Amino acid sequence: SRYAPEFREPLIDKEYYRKPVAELTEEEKYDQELKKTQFIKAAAATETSSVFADPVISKFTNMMMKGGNKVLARSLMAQTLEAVKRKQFEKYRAASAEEQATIERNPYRIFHEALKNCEPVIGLVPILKGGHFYQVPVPLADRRRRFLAMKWMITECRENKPRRTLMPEKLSHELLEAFHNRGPVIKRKHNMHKMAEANRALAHYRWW
């Protein structure tokens, strides 16, 4: 890295800086005073104070990008969100007043609740004990649990789709199916959890 270890990650929260001084906890108040005598990293090209920037969706975009084609990957995510909004508007208009209440037309809220439905609480680590490969039930961190949900989505759509279907049409159809706990990405989570019960007694081999 070209940043020395003494550099601090930038804080790009607009409201945080403009809060009244008394509203800030003394711990936060102390850090701000310390940061005045430190070096701050430059903000990333994609780090902005925009009110429409969601870290979860921005991360999902980077996991789809191939060869640094951010314009294409962002376009694919923009087309997906729109394909989900247009799919719920059609259902909402073609539904009764009672049914209309339940229907969710926010694509950003369908994406977050979809991913969370696919996240697995426990995973598996492959281990070779006595020249035999065993996978031991592991408890997954918040970072490993989130990564696996996004990875499983980007892999079901990339591979298990018809040749002429497009990613905005497969991903939209999968975010909505996961949003209802019916999709194949949810089935992957159910299989992972079910296998952990099979290897329930083999967690002892853990050394880490």
Partner 1 sequence: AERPRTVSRTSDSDPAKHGEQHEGQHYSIPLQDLKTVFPHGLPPRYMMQVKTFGEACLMVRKPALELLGYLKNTNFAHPAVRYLLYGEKGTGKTLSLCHAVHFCARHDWLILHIPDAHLWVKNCRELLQSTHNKQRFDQPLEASTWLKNFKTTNERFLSQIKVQEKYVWNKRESTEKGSPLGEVVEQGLTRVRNATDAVGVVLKELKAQSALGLFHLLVAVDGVNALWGRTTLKKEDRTLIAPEELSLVHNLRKMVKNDWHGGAIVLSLSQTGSLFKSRTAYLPHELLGKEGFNALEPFLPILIPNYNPKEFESSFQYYLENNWLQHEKASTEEGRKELRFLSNCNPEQLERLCASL
Partner 2 sequence: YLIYFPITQDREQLMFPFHFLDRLERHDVTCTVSGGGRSAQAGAIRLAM
Query: Is 101 among the residues that bind partner 1 (CB under 8 A)?
Result: no
Inter-residue contact 159 to 179 (CB < 8 Å) = no
Binding residue for partner 1 (CB under 8 A) from 16, 17, 89, 205?
Answer: 89
- Token output for 18: 């403009």
For the chain, the helix, strand and coil percentages under 3-state DSSP, each to the nearest 5: 60, 10, 35
Tell the residue number behind the tokens 């918040």, with chain if given.
142
Query: Is 14 among the residues that bind partner 2 (CB under 8 A)?
Result: yes
> What does R_g of the chain's alpha carbons equal in angstroms?
22
Q: How far is CA 45 from CA 48, 49, 70, in A?
A: 8, 12, 12
Q: What one-character DSSP code corresponds to residue 12?
A: -
Closest listed residue to residue 200, CA positions, set 141, 125, 138, 121:
138
The residues with which 125 forms a beta bridge, in sequence order, are 136
Residues 105-134 that bind partner 1 (CB under 8 A): 105-108
Query: Is 201 among the residues that bind partner 2 (CB under 8 A)?
Result: no
Query: Is 81 among the residues that bind partner 1 (CB under 8 A)?
Result: yes
- Token output for 103: 């229907």
The residues with which 123 forms a beta bridge, in sequence order, are 138
Picked from partner 2, partner 1, none, the partner binding residue 107 (CB below 5 to 8 A depending on kind) is: partner 1
Binding residue for partner 1 (CB under 8 A) from 93, 132, 143, 163?
Answer: 93
Residues 24-43 that bind partner 1 (CB under 8 A): none
- Give least dist CB 11 to partner 2, A: 11
Q: Among residues 3 and 16, whose Cβ is nearest to partner 1?
A: 16
Closest listed residue to residue 73, CA positions, set 151, 164, 146, 168:
168
Query: Is 12 among the residues that bind partner 2 (CB under 8 A)?
Result: yes
Q: Among residues 47 and 113, whose Cβ is nearest to partner 2?
A: 47
* Of 46-54, 109-117, 143-151, 188-196: span binding partner 2 (CB under 8 A): 46-54
Binding residue for partner 2 (CB under 8 A) from 21, 22, 34, 45?
Answer: 45
Q: Kindly list the residues in this chain that would bind partner 2 in the complex (CB under 8 A).
A: 12, 14, 42-43, 45-50, 70-71, 74
Q: Kindly list the residues in this chain that would bind partner 1 in the complex (CB under 8 A).
A: 50-52, 77-78, 81-82, 85-86, 89-90, 93, 105-108
